[PDB]
Each structure stands twice: as structure tokens, then as C-alpha cells.
Symmetry: C7
Subunit: 29 residues, 7 copies
């Protein structure tokens, strides 16, 4: 339901943050 | 309904943190 | 209710982290 | 109640993270 | 059930963020 | 209960992240 | 029990993030 959907949307935004950090780690090397 | 809406608000804030990190990354020429 | 209001306070605190990260990016460039 | 209080405590810890990031942004300056 | 599964997806995305932060450190050093 | 106890543990892990970031700001300065 | 277990798993991943930040500051 709606609460579980919103928690999955939180997990996706956290994966979005991880993609940006993996990009920064590439650029730093 | 208010609980699910506040969780979606948390996901939106986390997407805003991802956007700020993309700009930090780009932010080193 | 009280749980919804506390979740809204968590979203506000995450928006305060996004502002700070944007300021970090502006300080390097 | 105890769940709502713990959620408010998570929001307080996130504000401590924002405060430390704001300080780093002034340090980079 | 579905709420518990979504919380586990959140923990895994946080583990991805930790791996990316470790890699930023290693790129520097 | 067990849920409130786990939420308090999440708040302490976030205070632990803020300690590490305050030390990084103290060093930069 | 499964929701509380998943919340403790989140706290453990946050402690792993605090450890990675300490290692970033050493560099």
C-alpha cells in the first residue's frame, strides 16, 4: 500500500545519492 | 494518509540532497 | 497526528542538510 | 508517545549533521 | 511483509552509500 | 517497545556521523 | 519483529557510514 510505496521511494532516493557519490569517487582519481 | 504524505516529503528532500552532491562533484572542474 | 508531525520534522532537517551541501559547493567554487 | 519521541530524536540528530556541514562550508572559505 | 521489505531496501541503499564514501577516501589516499 | 528502541539506535548512529563531520571541519580550519 | 529487525539493520548501515567518514578524514 501507500506507506510501503513511499518507503520504496525513500530507498530509490538513497540509491540516487549513492550514484552521485560513486561519480565523485571516480572524478577524484 | 498524512503518514504516507510525510514519507513522500522525506524522499523529495533526499532527492534534493542528491542534486546538491551532483553540483559538488561538478564543482571541482 | 504526532507521528506524521515528527516525520515532517525529519524532512525539514534533510532540506537543511541539502542547503548546507549547496553552500559547501559554492565555497570551493 | 515513545515512537513519536524517537522520531523527533532522529530529526534532532539530522540537524546536528546540518550544523557540522555548515561549519565545513565556512572552513572551506 | 511489504513494509518490512521496503525497510530492508533502505538499509541496503545506505550500505551502497557507505561503500561509495570509502571509495572517495581511497581515491584521495 | 522494540520498534521505539530501534528508532533510538538510528538517532545515536546519526549523532555518531555528526561527530565525525565536526572533527573534519575542525581539521580543515 | 521483522519491522524492528529491519530498523536495526538501518542503524547498522548508518554506523558503517560514520566509520567511512572517519576514514575520509584520515586521508
Amino acid at each position: 500500500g501507500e506507506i510501503a510505496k513511499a518507503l520504496r521511494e525513500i530507498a530509490k532516493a538513497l540509491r540516487e545519492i549513492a550514484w552521485a557519490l560513486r561519480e565523485e569517487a571516480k572524478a577524484l582519481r
